[PDB]
Design a protein around this ligand. Sequence first.
Ligand SMILES: O=P(O)(O)C(O)(C[n+]1cccc(-c2cccc(-c3ccccc3)c2)c1)P(=O)(O)O
Ligand SMILES: O=P(O)(O)C(O)(C[n+]1cccc(-c2cccc(-c3ccccc3)c2)c1)P(=O)(O)O
Ligand SMILES: [Mg+2]
Lengths: 303, 306
Amino acid sequence: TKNKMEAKIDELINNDPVWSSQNESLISKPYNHILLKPGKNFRLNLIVQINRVMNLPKDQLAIVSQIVELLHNSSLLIDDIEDNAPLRRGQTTSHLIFGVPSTINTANYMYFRAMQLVSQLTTKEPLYHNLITIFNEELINLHRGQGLDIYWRDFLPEIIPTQEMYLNMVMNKTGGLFRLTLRLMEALSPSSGHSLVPFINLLGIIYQIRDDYLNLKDFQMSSEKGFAEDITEGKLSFPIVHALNFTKTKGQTEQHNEILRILLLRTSDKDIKLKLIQILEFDTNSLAYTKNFINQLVNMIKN
Amino acid sequence: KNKMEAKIDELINNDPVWSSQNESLISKPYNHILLKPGKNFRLNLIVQINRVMNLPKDQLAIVSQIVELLHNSSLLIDDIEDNAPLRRGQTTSHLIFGVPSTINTANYMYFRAMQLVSQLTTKEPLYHNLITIFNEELINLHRGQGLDIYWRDFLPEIIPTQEMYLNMVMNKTGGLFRLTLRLMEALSPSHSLVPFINLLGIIYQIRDDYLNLKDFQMSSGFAEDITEGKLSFPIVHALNFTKTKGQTEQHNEILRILLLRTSDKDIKLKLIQILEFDTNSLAYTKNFINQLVNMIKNDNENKYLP
Ligand SMILES: O=P(O)(O)C(O)(C[n+]1cccc(-c2cccc(-c3ccccc3)c2)c1)P(=O)(O)O
Ligand SMILES: O=P(O)(O)C(O)(C[n+]1cccc(-c2cccc(-c3ccccc3)c2)c1)P(=O)(O)O
Ligand SMILES: [Mg+2]
């Protein structure tokens, strides 16, 4: 009724928005699905290990953990949409089950739920301001890194990145969550000089180049060891970046172009992928180059 | 191994490298939607509201920028989520730069927006209030958008009621109206205008749902909401009306057309004719909007406005 309706609207607009625990469950489906995947012990082991120097009390360490786990899982949900990945940790990808729209919305929602947890880290406004800025800064870096990686891949051959460009993209893309985890911890430390940022930056780069490497190496050694999905994706991986620049430099026009063509196919044909990998093995010698580059990186730490 | 060790050492000891060219690459999907008019009515509302807030112009520019970023980014994401081919008569960004880049750019702008919040003030208490406001309304916006998408993609599992729909809108459409307002109120150097902005938000969304069908009916507007299978205000009224009146076949027929995700003009017209001739849903929505607007017009004791 013109009265009851106005009264109902009046009561609706004078209250916070209504949100039930049922509503919360319904929209958390994409996120709950990715949680079932393993790998959480080591990222927690990373946090733990790192704490053996930061000395954070345990309730605080646990909040950092929650923050990082949400950001990380949300990134994976989105990354998989962005890469059109059919699988994640041996399971069907969330966007294929619940659809791209819900998966995108849920992942972004969790970015903000993570943000909200930052206030549970302190009651001291000065520290709080610093933690948010860190949060803000590394998420900004994560997106800058991912944005370049995606652009190079989706607009290939518009830009053939050099090894230097690739490494700057990784510092942003992969170093983002590594630095975010460490920087939050270093701002919380009750310690008493320098940070482990440079170290974490190097760990990030070794992590990413090794990942790029094994994606091809595992497939080359065994078709049932991996799928070499980085090729299907058309990714400008470390070994690919070396092959594309080597070929251009040595004047191997045909090879340079065949590398691009296979990347642009977004193919899942195993033989075509194995051909590209053997091109990197025997012609550009990108695999050995990458293997050696990883080792040198690793020696920079162990030495 | 030292020239290589040297360059890595230089890399890991510096802030990550990011140039203005890199910034340009990444902004392309956002810039594309900028060629979209309307920015003035959104800034108008900002300027008009500022007559009660009176923020110093310099602070008003930053709020306005935070607002533009969030609104444009949310539209880029909205278009991917609805698989929309057009936005303001122009091809949507994701069809041009692809879905991957558009999502990433839109998300990047949410964070650029967030960074601008820290420049509204250096006062530590207030800053936190501003972040909290920001955080809370984005959360609401996603909850609402999440629920809207869920009802659409799971139909016919859940048919919302008018009440459920109104709560979804308070979260979805009210989020950014309230974010804008609440920020301005928190910064004001001078009763809350939040109730008024919520109503404005509800009016804006119902009217949006209404016009999407009316513009098509009065002239083949494409009625994309039908193609999208959206639980719009008229559709929600038609579904619950036929269910209550026990009109089983009309109920099912509306569900069937929505589930078709059809671009067929004749089929879309058939659904509209059900709404006009069977449920009288469009006339019901027209009336419902008028009533909401009257709540503002007949606000003599100024309960809602200042
Ligand atoms: O093969 P994908 O697409 O699953 C990929 O690993 C996704 N990805 C993107 C950004 C960061 C990470 C990542 C990898 C390892 C550890 C972290 C991490 C996350 C949080 C805290 C510490 C470390 C992030 C992975 P990639 O970086 O695009 O190769
Ligand atoms: O027709 P669509 O799909 O572009 C749609 O308007 C998208 N949408 C979602 C959320 C908010 C808004 C919106 C519309 C107009 C103005 C604003 C706004 C946002 C911030 C500050 C002032 C105004 C938000 C639009 P809808 O809500 O999904 O119907
Ligand atoms: Mg990836």
